[PDB]
Design a protein around this ligand. Structure first.
Ligand SMILES: CC(=O)N[C@@H]1[C@@H](O)[C@H](O)[C@@H](CO)O[C@H]1O
Ligand SMILES: CC(=O)N[C@@H]1[C@@H](O)[C@H](O)[C@@H](CO)O[C@H]1O
Ligand SMILES: CC(=O)N[C@@H]1[C@@H](O)[C@H](O)[C@@H](CO)O[C@H]1O
Ligand SMILES: CC(=O)N[C@@H]1[C@@H](O)[C@H](O)[C@@H](CO)O[C@H]1O
Ligand SMILES: CC(=O)N[C@@H]1[C@@H](O)[C@H](O)[C@@H](CO)O[C@H]1O
Ligand SMILES: *[C@@H]1O[C@H](CO)[C@@H](O)[C@H](O)[C@H]1NC(C)=O
Ligand SMILES: *[C@@H]1O[C@H](CO)[C@@H](O)[C@H](O)[C@H]1NC(C)=O
Ligand SMILES: *[C@@H]1O[C@H](CO)[C@@H](O)[C@H](O)[C@H]1NC(C)=O
Ligand SMILES: *[C@@H]1O[C@H](CO)[C@@H](O)[C@H](O)[C@H]1NC(C)=O
Ligand SMILES: *[C@@H]1O[C@H](CO)[C@@H](O)[C@H](O)[C@H]1NC(C)=O
Ligand SMILES: CCCCCCCCCCCC
Ligand SMILES: CCCCCCCCCCCC
Ligand SMILES: CCCCCCCCCCCC
Ligand SMILES: CCCCCCCCCCCC
Ligand SMILES: CCCCCCCCCCCC
Ligand SMILES: CCCCP(=O)(O)CCCN
Ligand SMILES: CCCCP(=O)(O)CCCN
Ligand SMILES: CCCCP(=O)(O)CCCN
Ligand SMILES: CCCCP(=O)(O)CCCN
Ligand SMILES: CCCCP(=O)(O)CCCN
Ligand SMILES: CCCCCCCC
Ligand SMILES: CCCCCCCC
Ligand SMILES: CCCCCCCC
Ligand SMILES: CCCCCCCC
Ligand SMILES: CCCCCCCC
Ligand SMILES: CCCCCC
Ligand SMILES: CCCCCC
Ligand SMILES: CCCCCC
Ligand SMILES: CCCCCC
Ligand SMILES: CCCCCC
Ligand SMILES: CCCCCC
Ligand SMILES: CCCCCC
Ligand SMILES: CCCCCC
Ligand SMILES: CCCCCC
Ligand SMILES: CCCCCC
Ligand SMILES: CCCCCC
Ligand SMILES: CCCCCC
Ligand SMILES: CCCCCC
Ligand SMILES: [Cl-]
Ligand SMILES: [Cl-]
Lengths: 333, 333, 333, 333, 333
């Protein structure tokens, strides 16, 4: 029996290696396999990865006439001491178990141990949509020991920034992913003390041109279309009135359609500001002709060429819209 | 073996400490990690948190030449007595178990015990949407012992209002969160007796300006647009009629779009009252011109300037709308 | 050890108390905590409740110098006999287990037993939507023994109609709940025999005024709007035609919007009958003017005041609509 | 102990009864409790039912002074041999376990056994939507032994067609259910040999009148409405043009609304053919007036009653539409 | 006892057969039962299948007077050595367990073993939607050993390309499936070494004609409809203006409806290019008449047949649209 080469029953494996003395160092490496999904309303993301641990335990040393190591599956884990890592700020997680538990332990003749397992985790990520669709988001995944403070267990990245590897084909449907890197920081709990925490960081961006074409283009086109009435004969009332009211209806249907396709976030975003300013411009173009028609009727009744209001509007409306665009795009980049 | 320092087999751990005498006090602290989601149709919310217990048991005392404590994981829980807390009015819950069970027990030389675990819970919260979107909601999470009355177990907050801590970055996508605090109250069950119950309370609010811009603004603009026809020449029938009917169509499409984007709650809310009053105003503006056209035709036929009805409507319609707004906003704040 | 006061190993607890003789009576009480959700497309509902059992077993009697009882958690259940209740016509269910299993057993010195547990269940409820939105639904939850016929186990409500309690704040978002009560009935299985079955009954109703305002009001308003054309000068063709076609478009958009907001049930309901009759009325109002215009043109061509058709339509259309409303509301209440 | 009346430890229950000789017959009965849901996009359905097995085993015979049988729950199953049935072509399934496992075994003095359990299963059902909404679908549920060929285990329906019972109130929201019956057939696996397979068959149909009223009626009405322009004076251009373009807009909104409410199946169905032919008819009615207006203008310019094209169109359009309807309804029933 | 014919307690089954020498070959066969679902937003698919393993182990040989084999269920798996296969790049998986675990082991007298189980798996599949709806996708499922390198375990397809079988009725609702085949490739891990990997490959295609009819047809029809205005008398302003603005509204509603029915992928696809070019064509047709009306008014005022712009537009617009179509369909096939 291979489990008799390790004196399992001759040691108390409820205590850590080196108990009573200096803390035992534990090194960590991570390989990220995929990014599975992201939820903008609930503000979280899901990832699948391999987690690997390295440490030494003299109680597991065994004699050998060669330098070959022994390999075990998950059934040995319950018989020896292993580190208790957990994911901070997570919502749910599990360890894969088909066709059996995806775990393993490799033991060297001198007592060095490698511990490897495959896991899927869902983690929280606070997002800010004020600048949508030109926003940028930063997310992180955090790893910590549940029960051992830094006086008993010292947790660190085994090879610095070389400890993190990512799959060549990692992708998300609606985002671009960039800038993976690692950091570390100490955390304090008033109940028990100081703990080491490890971080994996990355950044997300959107495809700007899709949103420009889908949203900003039609609204600008409809605003430009409302200016055509300034060049039409003021005596053609049955042509001037329906044009304005139909332009208002078209802009309203565009805004409703755009609202139906964005994530349901109930606060003001940049694209909403652009759309409602455009709507106001279209509304004012109808008030202009109402004033022109009333004044012309008054003059004809009193008495019994282009009106000045049309002449000024032909210049004033586009200049104001251009100024609004300059200010908007200088503010929102 | 560390489990032989505690005389596990020398005591009956199916009975409570102090059995037969006064009740044993148990103190509680809570740390809230995140708020995960909220469901308005099903009226519930989900939270993740750390739960900690404090009590003393002389049967667990052990000799020591120093003042160091001993730490165990979840496997020891089945061998000793622990308190049986549960969440009142919950729908589902679970204890996190990656990479192992997130539990631990720390025992002092004199028998003081700390018991800590990490849990996620979904709890019910009755909501009232009568004043939407200006409504305010209050929710709570409740903790109680399943099997021990106040004569056997005395449950209390360990440090009063200092027993509750919340994460600095706790947030929800569509709500603002404020005013966390704790309370206690006694509950009675006719089957078994009186029990102590603990409460965690907080309040939720919406972003008002988003809803004002998205709903109240377009409806007011369309009502103001329907008043333009009162200043148009009454002889221009092919201009007056299509304008009114198209305004009615536009208002209908706005209301349908607004209904499609709110939570599916099937009873009358304040925003519905505002929208349908505006729709009635638009309808009456079409009836007005129908009457004017009929009377003018009658006069011309009998026989073979501005009509009085237009002159009065130009004043009467805006004043009535202003009065309705004053009453509405004095009632609904 | 408290489990040695009961002679656990001295009895066969695979057989029922009173084996070989008359059936053992088992009394039941229920406390309903909440109604969690309802699904109209799948026709089911979800409930959380406390289930309590009462019976006597002389094998569990123990000596005592007082009248104190002994209390145990769920670990003792596997060592003694307990009744095997299950929920008939259910789709899924589970027993709550945080922070431990929500079970308990209390034993009196003379052998009386109380058995209590907390459970969540989803149950089927056939619904009929023919009279929507004026429909009424009745639902029930059913409890039965899996393996014991009425000759071996007699199941009954412990205190008649006083055995059922409901929470003061029980509510559903889109329904009103009324008339909780209990019944019993015998059921027959050809495979094994006769069994006792217990029932919990209640009734659901909708908020009528919300549906009246959202659906019936706009359709009636549009039908009334289509009658305006009967009072407009027949010589104003460019005013009469667009009005009718735009009214048809508006009614179509209303019907599409209403269809989008009801539960996806694919058979004919009362509100559909009302909407499509209104649509037919609007269609006929356009055919009327087509006939008038053709006849006037014919007369003028042959040759080279109000037409009779308008005069009759002004009376005939509203009277027919009123008659339809009287018949409809006498049929559907 | 009742388990000592059966000599459990005196037999090897890893082998089948009658090992080494002729196959053991196993009879099956089924009672269907409900149909829980159906998914048209994923093509599957869910059912809850009772499964019962009958066979004889002389190793379980016990002495008795009467003819009473002994009843056990699910804990005995692991100690004896039972048949290993599984559901072919299923996606997921489970056995109900509240308040305990819904299993039982009854043993007669001579060794006859009844084995009963309650289960929920989701099974695949390939569907064809070419004739929607006039399509008919056939589904089945299949039962087979996992590890025993027909040489070792003979599986059959215990009472032929009387072995299947269904609940009196079984229903689905959007379908009608008819024609339950059973069949059997032999299946071949190249890896291990021949196996017996049992089938449960049924048929589904839709409510035709709901779909006729919701889809076919409005499209026919709009096609008939487009024919009104053929009777309007050709000199009234501002009446003829807007009518045609608005009819096109109305038909487009109807088609979009209809597409939004059907199951998302991306290939051509019969109702799509009807709708797009109607759209083509409406388009041609606008081209007709364009030609008429151009020819009239040409004649007046050259020079400086009803046109023949209108006279022919008044006859030709309805006859072609009637012919299309005759062919369509002769093809699709 | 059949488990005593195999000397279970006489061997260490924590080590592989042939330990210390050449690697043990393991052959694999696969039978695919169904394709359950596909998710375009999350980019994954789900499959159900049978997995079979073949290898030899002399430690399991048993004496026999015949050539009959012995069959066991899943309970024996924990007592012997079996291969540890897992699915690479998967998100979730499970082994079916109704009415018991769907596993089995067959052992020949000379020690040959067959190991069979039924499993469901969800796997990732990166997709590219640039050419939608004319895109083609390729997916794969991958199988690998968790803990044994190629020096200890040699994994291969048992019968080459004959090792893969698929069900005759495999189908997906929205895709066509073709070209199943197998491959193999070696993979390298810096942590442990080289491993053998097996692949199952297949291809997916859409139904082109459904998308052509639903999207490309209406847009082309509306572009052709906008050209009618070039043949209408330029003096009929109240006919020319509303026609153009209503055509713009119709095209906008078509585009919104089409966007609502495609998978929510936020980057530019081929069908979007076609739709927005068509929208631009419709917009330019309105600018053309604005210019014509202004020039005619200027000429009449100065002074106090067909205009040249209409004559050129009647030719220029269709030729440009035809050229765009030729380029588009030569690029996108
Ligand atoms: C660096 C190292 O561990 N080398 C060892 C060596 O000490 C040992 O004698 C040999 C036995 O075959 O195996 C190798
Ligand atoms: C406050 C307290 O517990 N102090 C103890 C002290 O009594 C004990 O002698 C010492 C042993 O090192 O550990 C510390
Ligand atoms: C009604 C009843 O059970 N009364 C008992 C009494 O018989 C017993 O002597 C006493 C012992 O303290 O406890 C109480
Ligand atoms: C048909 C049958 O099984 N009859 C039996 C009979 O043989 C037996 O003597 C009796 C004992 O009470 O029980 C009954
Ligand atoms: C090819 C093979 O395995 N043949 C065997 C044979 O060796 C054996 O004597 C016989 C016993 O009945 O069973 C068969
Ligand atoms: C790894 O590189 C990143 C690059 O930004 C840096 O921030 C981080 O500190 C580096 N970590 C180590 C351990 O070198
Ligand atoms: C904590 O403060 C809140 C503030 O409202 C108060 O209501 C509550 O009673 C306080 N509880 C304790 C234990 O002081
Ligand atoms: C309880 O009251 C209801 C009231 O309708 C009645 O139907 C039922 O029979 C009563 N049951 C008992 C046990 O009294
Ligand atoms: C049961 O009746 C159906 C009726 O169609 C028939 O097809 C089937 O063969 C019958 N089966 C038996 C076992 O009689
Ligand atoms: C099986 O056939 C496919 C056909 O494309 C080929 O690519 C593959 O290499 C073949 N594999 C074997 C093992 O013959
Ligand atoms: C509330 C946070 C600042 C946002 C201010 C936006 C103002 C938008 C006005 C648009 C008027 C149509
Ligand atoms: C039913 C609860 C009181 C709500 C009353 C609202 C009345 C709205 C009338 C709107 C008419 C258009
Ligand atoms: C099919 C069950 C009876 C329903 C009959 C409704 C008839 C509705 C006709 C509406 C015509 C527009
Ligand atoms: C592709 C399978 C045959 C379906 C043929 C339908 C043709 C529809 C033409 C409709 C033109 C508007
Ligand atoms: C961004 C990837 C290349 C896509 C270029 C498409 C340009 C579309 C222009 C449409 C104008 C209406
Ligand atoms: C007995 C162990 C208590 C652990 P704790 O103080 O709850 C901190 C957990 C996160 N590192
Ligand atoms: C034997 C224990 C019964 C507990 P109960 O009377 O059901 C009250 C549960 C909530 N504190
Ligand atoms: C051996 C027990 C069989 C029970 P059955 O005859 O299947 C009836 C189950 C519902 N009371
Ligand atoms: C060792 C048992 C193999 C069973 P198999 O040949 O995979 C057929 C399974 C369906 N009846
Ligand atoms: C001790 C075993 C480590 C395995 P690993 O190096 O993590 C590679 C897993 C995939 N074949
Ligand atoms: C209309 C676009 C002008 C603004 C471009 C960016 C200048 C800051
Ligand atoms: C139109 C807004 C007037 C009401 C503002 C609030 C006054 C009570
Ligand atoms: C228009 C409503 C009249 C019908 C009311 C109810 C009379 C039966
Ligand atoms: C317009 C309906 C005529 C077709 C009915 C069915 C004749 C085959
Ligand atoms: C309008 C269709 C012409 C293009 C067909 C394909 C030629 C490359
Ligand atoms: C919004 C412009 C109105 C014109 C009156 C000067
Ligand atoms: C933009 C309209 C200005 C009115 C002319 C004073
Ligand atoms: C929120 C500031 C935006 C200002 C608009 C240009
Ligand atoms: C609603 C106003 C009607 C006008 C008749 C006095
Ligand atoms: C608001 C219309 C009043 C009619 C004039 C008496
Ligand atoms: C529907 C009314 C038509 C008028 C012909 C008498
Ligand atoms: C309702 C129209 C009747 C036609 C006059 C005979
Ligand atoms: C289904 C009967 C309704 C009749 C309409 C009044
Ligand atoms: C579609 C009909 C066109 C008329 C030209 C003869
Ligand atoms: C249907 C239009 C036919 C044109 C007359 C020859
Ligand atoms: C887009 C065409 C405009 C006409 C001016 C030459
Ligand atoms: C397409 C319009 C061209 C204008 C004539 C020069
Ligand atoms: C992305 C290239 C498409 C060009 C349009 C013909
Ligand atoms: Cl006009
Ligand atoms: Cl006109």
């Amino acid at each position: 029996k291979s489990e008799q080469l390790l004196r399992i029953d001759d040691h108390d494996f409820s205590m850590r290696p080196g108990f009573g003395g200096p803390a035992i160092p534990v090194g960590v490496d991570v390989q990220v396999e995929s990014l599975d999904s992201i939820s903008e309303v609930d503000m979280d993301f899901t990832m699948t990865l391999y987690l690997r641990h390295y440490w030494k335990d003299e109680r597991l040393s065994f004699p050998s006439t060669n330098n070959l190591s022994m390999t075990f599956d998950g059934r040995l884990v319950k018989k020896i001491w292993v580190p208790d890592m957990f994911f901070v700020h997570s919502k749910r997680s599990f360890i894969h178990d088909t066709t059996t538990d995806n775990v393993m332990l490799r033991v060297q003749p001198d007592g060095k141990v490698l511990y490897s397992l495959r896991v899927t985790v869902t983690a929280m990520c606070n997002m800010d949509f004020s600048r949508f669709p030109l926003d940028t988001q930063t997310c992180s995944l955090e790893i910590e020991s549940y029960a051992y403070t830094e006086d008993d267990l010292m947790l660190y990245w085994k090879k610095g920034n070389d400890s993190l590897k990512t799959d060549e084909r990692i992708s998300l449907s609606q985002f671009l992913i960039q800038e993976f890197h690692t950091t570390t920081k100490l955390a304090f709990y008033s109940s028990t003390g100081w703990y080491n925490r490890l971080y994996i960081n990355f950044t997300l961006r959107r495809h700007i041109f899709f949103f420009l074409l889908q949203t900003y283009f039609p609204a600008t086109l409809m605003v430009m279309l409302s200016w055509v009435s300034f060049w039409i004969d003021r005596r053609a009332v049955p042509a001037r009135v329906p044009l304005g009211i139909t332009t208002v209806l078209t802009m309203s249907t565009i805004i409703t359609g755009v609202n139906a396709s964005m994530p349901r976030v109930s606060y003001i975003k940049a694209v909403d500001i652009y759309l409602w300013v455009s709507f106001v411009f279209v509304f004012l173009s109808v008030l202009e002709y109402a004033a022109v028609n009333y004044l012309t009727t008054v003059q004809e009744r009193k008495e019994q060429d282009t009106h000045a209001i049309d002449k000024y509007s032909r210049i004033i409306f586009p200049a104001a819209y251009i100024l609004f665009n300059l200010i908007y795009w200088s503010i929102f980049s």
